[PDB]
Design a protein that fits this description.
heterodimer, A: mainly beta, Immunoglobulin-like, about 50% strand, B: mainly beta, 6-stranded mixed beta sheet, about 25% strand, globular, Spike protein S1 (chain B)
């Protein structure tokens, strides 16, 4: 399993951006998935999750500006970031969580990350 | 006869997060435990049934290689009667536990400049684990009352944290590969022995 982020760049504040993370490679079960971000010098904070049962949680900073969506058809994870403030500047990372099937167990994975950069 | 595949557990390139700990059933093989206890390379090596001398002389129906990474000050907790973040929420052993904990410092393998985010542990849980339970749930921890409504925020903890192993932490806060050997006798006579 090999996650790969994309989308994002420089953007004037109050604009929007769609992050895409694209899974590649199989595994013997289906797993939850998260967005993390790491600000300049601050550490990696959780942004959101989405689970097998289709439930989301969001971090209180982004609650209601940001939206997590999967298209399992294309093996693609989506972060809609709207009404971006400068605080939202960070390297953004997709993470796949664990799952079992039977004796086997899948650990998770992180991607390389992508830079969002929000001026004013 | 061929040779139990301890090779695959100990010399594994990657190792599990402690919340999401690996188990590897060992069956239908010789053993030779002495390759293990005579390594140089094991910082820790407590046995709790049995003198590891005389476990070479004995036979079991199955053997399990539980195997994760923690910080060094957590390796205290991988034992009978223990308590804290790791014993309570990530990997409990039973009070009657009879087998072997092995561990060793993996600061060279499992660290990176900026932090290794791959290893994680579980910080909160509505109760403690039963012996050998594992819990790979996400699910926002409700520390208050007044409920979370899937926001992570005040009293509303995303309950899996990363360790972020740098090679410039001190030994308490650097990563240790652990491996618990558990040994069960059953009906179906034997499978793993000693040559
Ligand atoms: C984990 O991996 C290491 C690295 O490949 C394994 O170490 C090797 O262990 C063998 C045990 O059969 C050593 O064997 C004997 O050593 C001498 C010289 O050191 C050699 O001349 C003999 O022919 C004989 O093979 C071997 O030296 C050692 N390899 C070296 C040089 O590093 C280890 O067994 C693996 N761990 C587990 C638990 O499987």
């Amino acid at each position: 399993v090999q996650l790969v982020e994309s989308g994002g760049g420089s953007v004037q504040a109050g604009g929007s951006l769609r992050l895409s993370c694209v899974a590649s490679g199989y595994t013997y079960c289906s797993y939850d998935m998260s967005w993390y971000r790491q600000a300049p010098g601050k550490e990696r904070e959780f942004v959101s999750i989405i689970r097998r049962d289709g439930s989301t949680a969001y971090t209180d900073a982004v609650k209601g500006r940001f939206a997590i969506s999967r298209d399992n058809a294309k093996n693609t994870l989506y972060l809609q970031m709207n009404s971006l403030e400068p605080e939202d500047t960070a390297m953004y990372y997709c993470k796949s969580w664990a799952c079992s099937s039977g004796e086997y167990l899948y650990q998770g994975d992180w991607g390389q990350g992508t830079q969002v950069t929000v001026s004013s | 006869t061929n040779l139990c595949p301890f090779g695959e557990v100990f010399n594994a390139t990657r190792f599990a997060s402690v919340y999401a700990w690996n188990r590897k059933r060992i069956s239908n093989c010789v053993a030779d435990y002495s390759v293990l206890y005579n390594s140089a390379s094991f910082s820790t090596f407590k046995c709790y049934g049995v003198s590891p001398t005389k476990l070479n002389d004995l036979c079991f129906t199955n053997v399990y290689a539980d195997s994760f990474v923690i910080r060094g000050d957590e390796v205290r907790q991988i034992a009978p009667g223990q308590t804290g973040k790791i014993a309570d929420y990530n990997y409990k052993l039973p009070d009657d536990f009879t087998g072997c904990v092995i561990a060793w410092n993996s600061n060279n393998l499992d660290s990176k400049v900026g932090g290794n985010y791959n290893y994680l542990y579980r910080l909160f849980r509505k109760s403690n684990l039963k012996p050998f339970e594992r819990d790979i749930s996400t699910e926002i921890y409700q520390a208050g009352s007044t409920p979370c409504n899937g926001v992570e925020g005040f009293n509303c903890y995303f309950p899996l944290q990363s360790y972020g192993f740098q090679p410039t932490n001190g030994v308490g806060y650097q990563p240790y590969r652990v491996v618990v050997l558990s040994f069960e006798l059953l009906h179906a006579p034997a499978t793993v022995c000693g040559p």
